Amino acid sequence: RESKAKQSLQWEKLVKRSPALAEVTLDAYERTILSSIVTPDEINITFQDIGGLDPLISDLHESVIYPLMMPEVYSNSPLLQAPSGVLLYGPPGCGKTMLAKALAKESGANFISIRMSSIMDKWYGESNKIVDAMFSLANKLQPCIIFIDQIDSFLRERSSTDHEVTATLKAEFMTLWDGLLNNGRVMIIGATNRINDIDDAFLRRLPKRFLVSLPGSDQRYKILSVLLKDTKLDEDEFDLQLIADNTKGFSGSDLKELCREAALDAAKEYIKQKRQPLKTKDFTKKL
């Protein structure tokens, strides 16, 4: 019911986006899996809301963005195609999933960001049908990004102690990942917080690795700059550099709460007027 309504709405948006999908024909499993296709309308974060990752944004535009959306520009050599696998890994909360958000927002390709419940199925045999529907829809709807959120759980360190169904699913993912690279505008992307849990064969299956590490001092400065945008601050009583060097060892999400929570205290009296500027002291008193 609601899944069918979401599928129809997503298909209407894709028809409005890509005119080449008017003649595109779909079976039951593919129609089922467009509910995982996300569009840049619901995503509210573009590439400009990420701070401290500007060189990584530059390598992103060089590797994942431009070759996928401008293959004619990157066609001087046959090996200039977009990579089959991109791994946006790093310590948790450093902005990898926001990088995926910005990819969906800015890159013209679709973002088929499935969720593991959608692929996973209780009836034996049907789960492989969901995987091949994923790959076939990704090939047929040509400009797209297969985003596999949390690459660690699926394609984990394989062993005989795991389920037979999950081993067959991993084998099929490897199988259609082999044919994934020869297709032009198709691509699989994973983003995770730990790398040791990734399967070594599947690690080889992602021949492009990104380093979303903990922010540095300059990266902390940029993160605090873009996190406090479109908010009312103060000029002389407030400074960001001392704050950035004070919050050493903090991921951007830890600064997100630090930006958020400390801004309540400076606005508690401001809220108290409706409940019934940011000094440099409010963020620092939260440390």
Binding residues for ATP: 90-97
Residue 208 or 286: the one with the smaller Cβ distance to Mg ion is 208
Residue with tokens 């902005």: 95
Q: How many residues of this chain interact with its own copies, rule: CB under 8 A? A: 139
Sheet of 85-89: strand order equals: 37-38, 110-113, 144-149, 188-191, 85-89, 209-211
Which of 231, 237, 239, 285 contacts its own copies by CB under 8 A? 231
Residue 149 or 236: the one with the smaller Cβ distance to its own copies is 149
First to last CA, the chain: 49
Partner interacting with residue 271 (select from Mg ion, its own copies, none; CB below 5-8 Å by kind) = its own copies
3-class secondary structure, 277: coil
Q: How far is the CB of 91 from its own copies (least distance, A)?
A: 7
Which of 20, 242, 271, 287 contacts its own copies by CB under 8 A? 271
Footprint on residues 55-74 left by its own copies (CB under 8 A)? 62-63, 66-67, 70, 72-74
Residue 67 or 93: the one with the smaller Cβ distance to Mg ion is 93
d(CA 196, CA 59): 24
Side-chain-side CA neighbours of residue 10 (13 Å): 21
Give residues in contact with Mg ion (CB under 5 A): 97, 149, 178-179, 191
210 contributes a contact to its own copies by CB under 8 A: no
- Estimate to the nearest angstrom the gap between the alpha carbon of 45 and the chain centroid: 11
101 contributes a contact to its own copies by CB under 8 A: yes
Per-residue burial over 199-238, b = 16 or more CB atoms within 10 Å of its CB, e = otherwise: beebeebbebebebebbeeebbbbbbeebbeeeeeeeeeb
Q: How far is the CB of 236 from its own copies (least distance, A)?
A: 20
Burial class (CB in 10 A: 0-12, 13-18, 19+), 13: middle
Report the 10 Å Cβ neighbour count for 285.
11
Which of 15, 20, 242, 287 contacts its own copies by CB under 8 A? 15
236 contributes a contact to its own copies by CB under 8 A: no
Residues after which a C–N gap over 2.5 Å breaks the chain:
276
Q: How far is the CB of 69 from its own copies (least distance, A)?
A: 11
Footprint on residues 166-195 left by its own copies (CB under 8 A)? 166-168, 170-172, 174-176, 178-182, 191, 193-195
Determine contact, residues 63/82, Cβ cutoff 8 Å.
yes
Query: Mask 19-48, x = binds its own copies (CB under 8 A)?
Result: x--xx-xxxx---------x---xxx----
Query: Mask 74-93, x = binds its own copies (CB under 8 A)?
Result: x-xxxxxx-x-------xxx
Partner interacting with residue 166 (select from Mg ion, its own copies, none; CB below 5-8 Å by kind) = its own copies
Which of 48, 232, 277, 285 contacts its own copies by CB under 8 A? 232
Residue 157 or 239: the one with the smaller Cβ distance to its own copies is 157
Spatial CB neighbours of 285, under 8 Å, sequence gap ≥ 6: 262, 265
222 contributes a contact to its own copies by CB under 8 A: no
54 contributes a contact to its own copies by CB under 8 A: no
3-class secondary structure, 149: strand
